[PDB]
C-alpha cells in the first residue's frame, strides 16, 4: 500500500543511488589524518551505538551520524582529543534531523562525561554544518535495506534483524567498508542474512531493481562474511550486545555460516 509508496519507490531508489555517490566519504582519508586511526574511529562508532541505546534512538540516526563524521574527517584534520566532540555534534545533528524527540544538548554534554562544554558542542555543530554545507539527507545502509526487505517471500523478521545487525557491524571498520557504497553493503548484508537464516540467495527481483548480482557483491560479501565470523573476537562489542535483545529477535546469537558457496 501507500506506506510502501508504489508510485514513487523506483524514483526514490534511483535518487538515493545518485545521492550516495555524492555523500560518499573519501576512501583513503584515515591515512591523511596525522593523529587518528581506524581503531580510534571504531571506538567512537561503538560508543555512538551505546549512546543510541541509552537514548533509544533510531538506527537510522546512528547511520546518519557515522556518515556525517566520515565526510567531516574527509576534509578536516582532527586531534584525538577532539574526535569525540565531532562525533557528539554529528549525533546531535542526526538526532535533530531524524528523531521525533531528539535528546537535548545538555544530554549530549552529559554523555561525554563533561569532557566538553555545551558551548563547544554547539560550536562544533555549526562547524559540521558549514563543512557539510547542510547536506544532511544522506542515504544510509538502512534506507536501502528496508526497500530490499519488500522482496522477501514471505517476510521474515530474523532475516530483517540479522541484515540490520551486519549492516551496523560495517559502520565500525573503516577498513574495508569505506570502499563500499551503502547500497552495496546493504545488498551484501541482505544476501548474507537471507542465506544464513533460510539458505536462499539474493533474489532475481533485486537483480532487476539494483543491477547488482552475486558477482558484483562478491568482494563485499567476502569481507562481510569475515566480519561476521570474527565478530565475537572484535575489540568492539556494543552491536553484538544490542542485537542480543528481543527487540531485534536476538539475531547476534545466530551462528554464522562457515561457507557461502558463491
Amino acid at each position: 500500500g501507500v506506506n510502501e509508496v508504489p508510485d514513487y519507490h523506483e524514483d526514490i531508489h534511483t535518487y538515493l543511488r545518485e545521492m550516495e555517490v555524492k555523500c560518499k566519504p573519501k576512501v583513503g582519508y584515515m591515512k591523511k589524518q596525522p593523529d587518528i586511526t581506524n581503531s580510534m574511529r571504531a571506538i567512537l562508532v561503538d560508543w555512538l551505538v551505546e549512546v543510541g541505546e541509552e537514548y533509544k534512538l533510531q538506527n537510522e540516526t546512528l547511520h546518519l551520524a557515522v556518515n556525517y563524521i566520515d565526510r567531516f574527517l574527509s576534509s578536516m584534520s582532527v586531534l584525538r582529543g577532539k574526535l569525540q566532540l565531532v562525533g557528539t555534534a554529528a549525533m546531535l545533528l542526526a538526532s535533530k534531523f531524524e528523531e521525533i524527540y531528539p535528546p537535548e544538548v545538555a544530554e549530549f554534554v552529559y554523555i561525554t562525561d563533561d569532557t566538553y562544554t555545551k558551548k563547544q558542542v554547539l560550536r562544533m555543530e555549526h562547524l559540521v554544518l558549514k563543512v557539510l554545507a547542510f547536506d544532511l539527507a544522506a542515504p544510509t545502509i538502512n534506507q536501502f535495506l528496508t526497500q530490499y526487505f519488500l522482496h522477501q517471500q514471505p517476510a521474515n523478521c530474523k532475516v530483517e534483524s540479522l541484515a540490520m545487525f551486519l549492516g551496523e557491524l560495517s559502520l565500525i571498520d573503516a577498513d574495508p567498508y569505506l570502499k563500499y557504497l551503502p547500497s552495496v553493503i546493504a545488498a551484501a548484508a541482505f544476501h548474507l542474512a537471507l542465506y544464513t537464516v533460510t539458505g536462499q540467495s539474493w533474489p532475481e527481483s533485486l537483480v532487476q531493481k539494483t543491477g547488482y548480482t552475486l558477482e558484483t557483491l562478491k568482494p563485499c560479501l567476502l569481507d562481510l562474511h569475515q566480519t561476521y565470523l570474527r565478530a565475537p573476537q572484535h575489540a568492539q562489542q556494543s552491536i553484538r550486545e544490542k542485537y542480543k535483545n528481543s527487540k531485534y529477535h536476538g539475531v547476534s546469537l545466530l551462528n554464522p555460516p562457515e561457507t557461502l558457496n558463491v
Binding site: 509508496v5 524514483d11 531528539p102 547542510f134
Partner: protein, 293 residues
C-alpha cells in the same frame, strides 16, 4: 556560501514564521529580488533548530519550478539567513483579496496542475511536506504557484516508519492522522491538496474544524462515516471509536456544487478515505480535468 549580507538591501518586512521575520530584499549587484528568512540562533540554547536543519537540507535537494527555490544560506556565528526567490503573494491572500466573484476555472486548473507537479517531485525525492495550505503556496506575477515553508517537512524511508503525530494544520489534516494511525505516507499531502482544490473553487475551507474530534465529524458528515468496506482497517485504528455517529455519504456534486464532472472525479479521488486508494500526485497529473490547461 556565495553571498554575504552586505550585498542585500532590505526593502520591507513581508511576514514572519517562528525564529523570526521575513524581509523582501534586493541584491545590489545583480538586481535580484529575494526573500530573506532570518533564523535567530544566539537566542537559541539548543543550537541550530531542527526545523531549519530540515528546511535547509531538504530544500537544497529540491530543485523544481513549483518549489520555492533556496538560493543561499548565510551562516554567521549569531544568525542564519535563508535567501529565497521572491514571490509577491500567497494563495490565501489572493483568494481573500482578489477572487471576490471567484477564481476563474482556467487559473484553478493551472494552479492545481502546478501544485501536483511540485508535490510529485517532493514524493519522488523522499520528502513529505506535511503542511500544505494556501498560506504556504506562493504565487508570482507570471502565473506560477510554488510549494513553500518546508519547516514541517520530512525525509522518509521506504516503507515509511512512525513519524511525528499531529502534523498538518488541522483544516488540511488527513483522517488517518486524526485517527492516530501508526503510519502515514504521501497520501496525507494529497488530502491537503484536495482540501485546497475545493477551497480554490469556493474560497472557503472545506473542513473548518475547531478540534480534532470536530474536524473528524465534519469530514464524516461530508464524505460519510467510513466503515470496513470503504476503508479496511479503519475500525481497528487507535483512535477510532465504535460510538462514532454513522453519517450517510452525500452526493459529491453537493460537496462542491459549481464543479464539473471531471473536477468532481479528481476531487473525490484526492479525498478517498483509504490512503492506499487515494490518488497519487503523479497519477493525478494525467486526470482528464487537466486536458485543457
Amino acid at each position: 556560501g556565495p553571498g554575504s549580507m552586505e550585498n542585500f538591501q532590505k526593502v520591507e518586512k513581508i511576514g514572519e514564521g517562528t525564529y523570526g521575520v521575513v524581509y523582501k530584499a534586493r541584491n545590489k549587484l545583480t538586481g535580484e529580488v529575494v526573500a530573506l528568512k532570518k533564523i535567530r540562533l544566539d537566542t537559541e540554547t539548543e543550537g541550530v533548530p531542527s526545523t531549519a536543519i530540515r528546511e535547509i537540507s531538504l530544500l537544497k535537494e529540491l530543485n523544481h519550478p513549483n518549489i520555492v527555490k533556496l538560493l543561499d544560506v548565510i551562516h554567521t556565528e549569531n544568525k542564519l539567513y535563508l535567501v529565497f526567490e521572491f514571490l509577491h503573494q500567497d494563495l490565501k491572500k489572493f483568494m481573500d483579496a482578489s477572487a471576490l466573484t471567484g477564481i476563474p476555472l482556467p487559473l484553478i486548473k493551472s494552479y492545481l496542475f502546478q501544485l501536483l507537479q511540485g508535490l510529485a517531485f517532493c514524493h519522488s525525492h523522499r520528502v513529505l511536506h506535511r503542511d500544505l495550505k494556501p498560506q504556504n503556496l506562493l504565487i508570482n506575477t507570471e502565473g506560477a504557484i510554488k510549494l513553500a515553508d518546508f519547516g514541517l517537512a520530512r525525509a522518509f524511508g521506504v516503507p515509511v516508519r512512525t513519524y511525528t503525530h499531529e502534523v498538518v494544520t488541522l483544516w488540511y489534516r488527513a483522517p488517518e492522522i486524526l485517527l492516530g494511525c501508526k503510519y502515514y505516507s504521501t497520501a496525507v499531502d494529497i488530502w491537503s491538496l484536495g482540501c485546497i482544490f475545493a477551497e480554490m473553487v469556493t474560497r472557503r475551507a472545506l473542513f473548518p474544524g475547531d478540534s480534532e474530534i470536530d474536524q473528524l465529524f465534519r469530514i464524516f458528515r461530508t464524505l460519510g462515516t467510513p466503515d470496513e468496506v470503504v476503508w479496511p482497517g479503519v475500525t481497528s485504528m487507535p483512535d477510532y471509536k465504535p460510538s462514532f455517529p454513522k453519517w450517510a455519504r452525500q452526493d459529491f456534486s453537493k460537496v462542491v456544487p459549481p464543479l464539473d464532472e471531471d473536477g468532481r472525479s479528481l476531487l473525490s479521488q484526492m479525498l478517498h478515505y483509504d490512503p492506499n486508494k487515494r490518488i497519487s500526485a503523479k497519477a493525478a497529473l494525467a486526470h482528464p480535468f487537466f486536458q485543457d490547461v
